[model samples]
Target: LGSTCSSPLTHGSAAPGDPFWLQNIQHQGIAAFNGNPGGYPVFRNVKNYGAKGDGNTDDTAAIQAAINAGGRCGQGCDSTTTQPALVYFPPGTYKVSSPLVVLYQTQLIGDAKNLPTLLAAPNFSGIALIDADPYLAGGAQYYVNQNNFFRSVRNFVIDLRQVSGSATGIHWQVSQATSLINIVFQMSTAAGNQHQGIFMENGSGGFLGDLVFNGGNIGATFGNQQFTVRNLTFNNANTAINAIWNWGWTFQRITINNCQVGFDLTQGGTSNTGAQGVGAEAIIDAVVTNTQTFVRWSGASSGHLQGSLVLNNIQLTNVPVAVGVKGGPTVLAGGTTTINSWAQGNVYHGTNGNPTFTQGNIANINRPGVLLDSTGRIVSKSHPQYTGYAPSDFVSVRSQGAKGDGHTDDTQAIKNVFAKYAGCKIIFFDAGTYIVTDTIQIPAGTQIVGEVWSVIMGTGSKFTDYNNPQPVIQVGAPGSSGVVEITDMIFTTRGPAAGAIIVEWNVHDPSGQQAAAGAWDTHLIIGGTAQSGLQVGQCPTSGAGGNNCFADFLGLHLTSGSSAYLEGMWVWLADHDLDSGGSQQISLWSNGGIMSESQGPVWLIGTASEHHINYQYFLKNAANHYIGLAQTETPYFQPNPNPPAPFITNSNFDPSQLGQGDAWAMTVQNSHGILVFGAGFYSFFSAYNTGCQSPQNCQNQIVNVDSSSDIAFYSLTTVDTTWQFSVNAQGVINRSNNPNGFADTITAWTRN
Candidate 1:
């Protein structure tokens, strides 16, 4: 027998009353409760910091305070102790005074498309509306606000009309490397004359892209350092890029229309540690308006200016002049830049072997040439190109002959696109309904995204195995583990498809002796008027209890489980109506052993389902799945008039395993570590009969966890009809971890 005396628990380094012990305690407390401990408070609301975006009221001080709060509490102050905040700007209009300066390690995020406007409070000839550093002023070496090398500003428009005379939109003076992404500058006359939309000065390193500049005199100006600018569009700007002596700067994928000048390298020369001391620069894939001059590189003058500039894949329209020089007017020379392939425009002027180019006619033909290390070696060197796109991006859906007429069989088109662009970071689809005839296999590392209307229509194709019809989209190999994303697009069937939009490889071998892994997406929205259903795996012979088939075989169609996850995903019927009827519903189920416990690792938030006809969701084996913001409705019928009430959770296997059960807000069977919070269920019980049992009648339960433990349900509510929670054998619903414990939240009508 052990000692029977009560003693203090042995804790390592037990120094009584030591303050660090309390610090350790607090650290654990923060981790256990905080949603994002590593980078918690990622969203710092402006309203809480004292700002009103009421258009008239100046929200300058308010926004500043919010930013100050973002840097408060050790945030962005010292990386060793605190995390930086992502100062959030919700969709609204806010007015700011001249040049609202932002501290280092701070970020401003908003929805540009949602019309979130940072309206400059109309000042004729004011400082840049947004400045990271005062015009030519400084920020003496600062902390990351807590990051390594990231100062972010995403989404939103900068209105320059209010600043008439001459003003800038965003001017940044970053010494270290900086990444500026997804920022749009808008204006008409106010940003005219000598105004520069974006004037960035970086001594260390910088990357600028996915930016749009409109109606500005000078689109951008990069000076005196190593810089990379790409994916830039300029409309109605007098000049596109004015490179003032850049040491090693790379400019690519630049599309400039109606601009007086494209690459104005007239004053090109700078300093870098590379072989090109004063001017090593690389420019590639530039598309410019042929109505004006393309390049104006004045030959280097100073002996100290030795670096060269390389231009390749430069496409231009025609009127005249490809390469021009300091009023001297020459054919083109200098060991500085190389020109490999150019389309249109008569690249060179006045018979210095008149370098051929296309003019008015877009009779594009790559004027066979070379640049940099190839045929035209100015400095005779090649530098790294961090252009956002990989080689896979070179191959688009259109490259595979994908005709998005909504009738053409674009299935093969997209499939080939996936195969060829397998390693691509992304595959883009045009805003056309590309009809697919088979399961769109998503390869690893490939994310498919569409513009406003890139829809993938599925032509009902049959795929049956130990299960029913297959999912319209299949991600990952049958037995592999990974993720593929389908985003901002519509997934529907041409009239009648009999499965879900996604079929995560959860198949059991023919012998019914094996299974596979699965997949998911963060912001994926799966919809279509087509039919969707899951394949059910064999249920346990014993059961959740008996007449209740859910006990026998809980919802499982073949099977699918993953440890990886996305933020949130959605499901709905074809008509986009909850009152609509359909056969497809997302399901998850499993057997014992490997197919059971070894099977869960799903992350979900605001996961919800809608439409009628059947069960919205079915839960099987468990793991760490954070389920919330969920609901279910549209209790359809198995028969014509009433009874049998159909279930949103699951139907019976004996007779109606095909489809027959009352709807359910949610139904779980034998799961563990599944935490449910902030959920609402509706009319789970049959509408016709009012009340039913497990197999029939009103069988809807707001939260049903059977034969499970370590599972939690919080802030759950059911309106109209159904049970609060249906309990069964060996099930432990821990209410202690809930808000105010179990005895507080449940209502009077919640009864078994």
Candidate 2:
């Protein structure tokens, strides 16, 4: 269903013959609004009560008048589908006692510019609402009855900025396919109201855009249908958006940014079979930025993400828990769930102590690319404890002249040092525990190594504001490259809710800028019974720029109840009991390799779990090797020309192995170059060295093999050359082998 056209045309002005005219455009472009038959009319400052096709400001009378003026079905102006009316709300405030009923095929347009419209009522129950009666025909009661058939509230802007009430904002009961755009739904009641900002029950298609919902228990709920919401802000609400028992719905290009809790979908109520159906495939391109918990998807055995969920271009900041997808059968299959970018305080797994099932599935929630600075450096700022050193003079442990007794207030000193030298390299700490309250930034190329039991402990610390609150250790940098090494240090926070560490690197270069030159690395170690760890990842910049160049951790030992979080690493260690929750353990989100010395084999791992052991080595004392070779010298054989009396023409010569310690026999050809020969000669030869001095006097060679139990050889030759050579019986060649070979053998025997 694709069409190409040339030229741009307005909705009402374009005809079928027009180049860019499109028909049946649903919920997006021109088809978004339901237009009147005559033309697209503007509704300004006019009130409506029981009005029908009339333009007056009676508030109550105009509404009734319009309904009666059109055509009354059964005499009293009740049911007439002939005339289509337009109810307008102009810039002033209008009070309503009863809910405004929209008959079939009616348009309610509001003036947004010239007049600020306000819909306020003192004792109004469910103000600015539609569908008062139930629409049920059979004996079995339905959710909507026939008497409350305002099925034509399509294309309406029920602006409620001037409206305050203790009831539901826009209750959509028995409504089918309506568009509520640019509307503000608010409640002013203190308590006991239990109001809903926009309640959608048993409805089908709807387009809710540019909506602000405030002060309500629930912002918006959808039972089982498709809906599109763009630029909607929900504030001070118990539950922002809930969609239960919904199937085959698509929420394309919607933003739920800056809310207390962005979106919640749970299966708790006993309505509609309680199966909770399949979770909708929502393309959340919105920025769930600056919220406590951005998005929460929880359910029992029923609620699951069955369809595709794509999350693109999202920014999270200062959020305690960013995303919590709990409950079983929550399958996110056959779609890309990319975490375009994120910057938040912390995140938690499980729902109210219930663990969700994330087995064998790929969730690209909010993973930003690596952060590289302007100088191609992985910028990292860290804090280290140093004793007997002034805060201002403490540049780095490498620069520090004095050593502390391991019980100094090194937190302030380290901060002052980083303030002075923003991107310095490496900080070292001696043995002993030092108490730290504030976050210490270890700039790029800074290595904070500690002795065996050296620890920067912060067991009990607190900060009021959660947004920019102090973490135990905050490691970050802009576009700089460096490393932070914290060995045998236990970092704990007194605040149980606060995170132990935050490691981030960001490089924002708009025009695809490359960094100058630098490297970033952070290393951590645990040696105590306390529980806490580190975080490493790239931060976000303005116009899509940043990267994480390099990071590593070595000999990290987690004690009982201690845990470390490694975001990126090339090599790592997991020594403590990870299975036991109380024992010291390590968890990796994005890293290169984890070194484990079990009784099995060594494996090369990747991001995918199934690809964990792509390549494995099973043999002992067997090494993996890579080699490159180029010809720098050539071998030639010269014989004694003038013969003596008894001239014995013995042309015997031995050539040295380039990389192997062996003796090679040399032979000279008429025009061809020298050729060397020997077997078990040099372990293994490569395909690039198949020809042994066949064409010219020069050749390149490379050899590799598995076993080192034998001596190997290669031969070079020309005619009429006499030479005597002796190869060591120990099968090893010393350096300075002019026509010699290099060896790949290791031995414990030493020559006397």
Candidate 3:
């Protein structure tokens, strides 16, 4: 595996004369649905906008110019998918005195061959160097925190070492489909250093990984609904992470060296009041060295299931305290030790369903051999950057005959491109919507890279019949075995696409290649865009369903012989319009979010599925799956027509049993070796009403697991759902048993 990996991308290394393909490729992308479609520029280099990255010139205004160009979505605008920008920055240090405000539907990417630096001036004046959402005088933000969607920042070194006062690298207030990857934060190391890497106040977010922080007061301070973080290293920081609040979060493959505290979750109190702190936190495969305390909690675990904590495979060196209270005693002592599995919350076993408040070792965690590496750790693979492969290895879709102009029928053109360049070269899709009337079969051994979420939308009569569901994008033939990687794309549908299965994955990784068939930063965003025709203007939130507003039959389907590694994937059927002004609510319909029947070795990290009528995630007769930080939301307009009304129950997709009330957040049946590290299943509305929140009964049951499955759940959280976990569609664990802050949590539930 090490022999096949690409070399570390650095300045003046990997490729000499040839830079990254993103910098060399011909960029002719356009926002096809915008008012001035032909005039919109999707890709903008900062140098063209008067940004000199010579380490001296203040490039603040010019950098912001690249983001705010083309009348993109900004402060006055709620949201718009019509304007998308990929603001690229070449190598060099860009000095800035203020925040580089990131607008909606934008991606700020630096060259991976030589990562650029955003250096803060000595007297920098802003909340953060890069601000995703700005706060006004009256505390009103530019965008709703929970709805701040479709943005990413990758491959940059944010340097705050010159600033003497308090400074932060990024103020990332974002939601789904947002990511921060391959970023390094350099802060002041002096005494009383008031520097931080990231300060995210509040949002329903997201995923960030491959980040390193050096010399900061805090590496990253977070307060999100739920998030999945992996492969973050902090060296010589006061505190690595300060988690303010969350419903549930998962931290995997983390490394902290010479830090004062590894994690600090001591604020907001651990009570059953509305002001909840970190609800549930799961740490897996973490290594801490020379840390004073590994984890510091708000208070000790008491009654009412206030907060949940789970630690698995933690290797500590010279760490005095493993778990400590804010001003209280040490919960667990640590020093050069390894904790296999330890939890502090409720624990249930088998079908009996009575949970016991546990604060000790949790035994018998099943680690499937197929899902683990040779070192016995769960397999993890980062998103491919293709730094070693030069520009010659890529073929442009538009250059190969597909006019990605939103109105053109590019089905045959796309199929021809795949037939010509599937195994030989990488496919580069320009930043435009490619409308396909039929299925686009992506073959094996293909690497598809997109420019800022290039869209492949299925429409017309091929995707209209609800009785005969068809796949829009099919990955591999039935039993094909090869590696396929798809990154930075959107798989969606035109409205009245009730028969459209957005993506069907049947590609399995070849022997000895783990997590090779995967997709990262790729999403299934059905409806809500200008091209989808299912916006608020067409389908208002009046509970009156329109036949032309059906978005998809299913968001994603993983067949029985498939294995996948899906990261940062939000399979969402939109509950509101993102293109029309004001972010108005819409009532588009979809049957389900993701239905997986893969046999073995499928990993889902930082994945969410929302607003589907039948269910969010249904794993049927599957085996060997690792899911971390899996989030879901039942449709806001559920139980009005309930489910199977907008579309009939297709037995081919629906589970063997359907529970009472709203859709199931998760349904697991006849599966083995299923490990859910952290999950947050939320039910917020009933017929567009929040009255059920007081009763905590928006849905009667949320998660159902059959007795035959060998599964384990850690840090499971629920919002306004009566039953946290059920057995065979029967409510077994009630919310009254575990009343957390604003939600409820179950630390560990193992059925073996």
Candidate 4:
């Protein structure tokens, strides 16, 4: 049995640039022979070790002997302690009965330079014949009971020709770093069973290069740490890499080139719940090229892609469904992808047909196109070539000829002049009324000006049907890359069917295709409008709806839709008579106002007052008022009140001195100061004051008061004696005096 055994092993020096041969020589002499110079180290034959290699037989002990003598520990040999050992096996089939466990810090080098070693065996139900012991239940149980033998381990390398197994070929269960290079694992049995090429559990920091796994249940399973896989190929597997159940693990700088299923990260276990929070998954420049693959989200899993999916510079053929995200709403929320220059056969799909494309929402249709600016309001020109053109050059119309002054009747001349100057600024009308009948199509970069009173009146001819009126001064379709600006223009139709002015951009033909190129949509002034606007339903079901369907009004008028932007404009209802129905005049009107399907923002500014007018029921039914900016449905109006008069008063004391307490005092002596008067025995009082005297005198008194008195004395020394006296005063005083002399001999002293 040992003589017939065949395994890839040779003991010799290898030439330059041959890694396999060089590794074999190092393992055999430098490491295995303890620095002993030797040509080669021939391993003991399988017969010496009592091993078998029959086609249908198990040669487990034989291969173990070779591995034991090669460099592995616990085999009565320590090649690594002295030097590494190199075990050689001649060409023959060798089967393994059980796993070949290699103890720590060993290198299993395969000699494929001179001869190839073939390891042939039937499918086994256990882990790879060579793997960490703790990975197996029985092995771990035994190791736990027997002196904890699994504790001594650091690093290992496994270089094999190929491993065809029923179960996982290589399992790294212990906590150690490992590397597998240029290895292939294929299915060994016909029965469909659980098989994986390589499995890493609780393993951290490893390198897998040039590895290929074909026809397996699972290619690789990595959990809990950083690892790298370069130049790997996987085919016919349920999943290539199962990182869903992994927590706190990062697969970085990995490349999946040509694989059936690139990644199946649907495992969301409790241990990995919040562990998979933001920035947990880092796929850096990893690509799925030349293969139709699907990266789906299963279970209640959640994670974000912290990288860009660059879909350019790739050669793809017959590849469909390149990217598939199947999860809840919040599940693939924050991911960015740039798709450009792709040549057919690439499809992308998201949950419920919703994918984030070009930083916007996109339906998950299986196509190669991308969604750009979902929320942008696109105003295409009337021409087919300008369907999606964004204008960069716009000229404001300022020609005086285009203005319809209040008395001007040159509607045709204005149109002719505009047609002559194809690209020019808008013609502004300064508060004047112009009579016109022909439809006015404002060209690109042309602005027809209108003021509060600048009116465009339709008086040429009235259509037979009053409900279908034609626009008087219609703004032309936007030419290719052209823009039309209309501001402050009052468009009124006298004909029963004469509609207000029409403004359009990129008008679509009956087939829904654009008619011309360079014809962009129009952006009317914020507070602009069109009266008697009609739609398809309002038209006589015969010809195409009058050009009003595409003309959008922007203002606060009642006819403009709530979506319209009416910032600073006014709408005046001239006539109360309804044209058709018993409806009042509408401040503004459009086919349907601004459409929700419009691609841009619509702003409304003010409100219009629609008075009650008796008209036909149809006309009254159309009496709806529209203001886009109002927060409420009801109209808002505020009125002014009356004014009042000023206050007045008369005062004796100076008002400027009233603020000062000690400035002045009232008097009767000089008409400005205090006075004292003598009454030869009589008292005197000054005239009544009319104003306040000082602080605390009165609350609202406007005048001051004072008094005067005189004192007299009778002469007892003799009759006919006279006395006079002067009084000096400091404060206001009132005096009363009485004489003693009788009426017969009275003498008096007078004081003034």
Q: On residues 405-483, what C-alpha lDDT tens digit does candidate 3 reach at each position? A: 8999999999988877776677899888999999999987778899995999999999999899999999988888787
Summarize candidate 4's per-residue lDDT along 427-538 as a digit string, tens digits.
4343333556566655433434332234454543432222343444433342222333444344543323223333222211222222121111111221112222331233
Could you give me the TM-score of model 1 versus the true structure? 0.40
Task: Return whichever of 1 and 3 wins on lDDT.
Answer: 3
Q: Which run of 10 residues does model 2 get worst, by summed lDDT?
A: 607-616
Winning model by TM-score = 3
Task: Write down the RMSD of candidate 3 (Cα, Å).
Answer: 3.1
Model 4: per-residue Cα lDDT at residue 721: 12
Model 2 lDDT, residue 209, Cα: 48
Which digits, one per residue and each the tens of the lDDT, describe model 2 over residues 614-729?
00011112111100000001111101011110112212111112212111221111111101111111211111232323221121221221223121112111111111122221
Ranking by lDDT: 3, 1, 2, 4
For all candidates in order, the CA lDDT equals 0.42, 0.30, 0.88, 0.30
Query: What's the number of clashes in each of the models?
Result: 35, 104, 0, 86
In candidate 4, how many Å is residue 131 off? 1.4
In terms of lDDT, model 4 sits at: 0.30
RMSD of each: 29.4, 32.4, 3.1, 44.7
Model 1 agreement with the true structure over 510-586: per-residue lDDT tens digits:
22111112222212222312122211111111212111111101111224433333222334332121111222222
Candidate number with greatest lDDT: 3
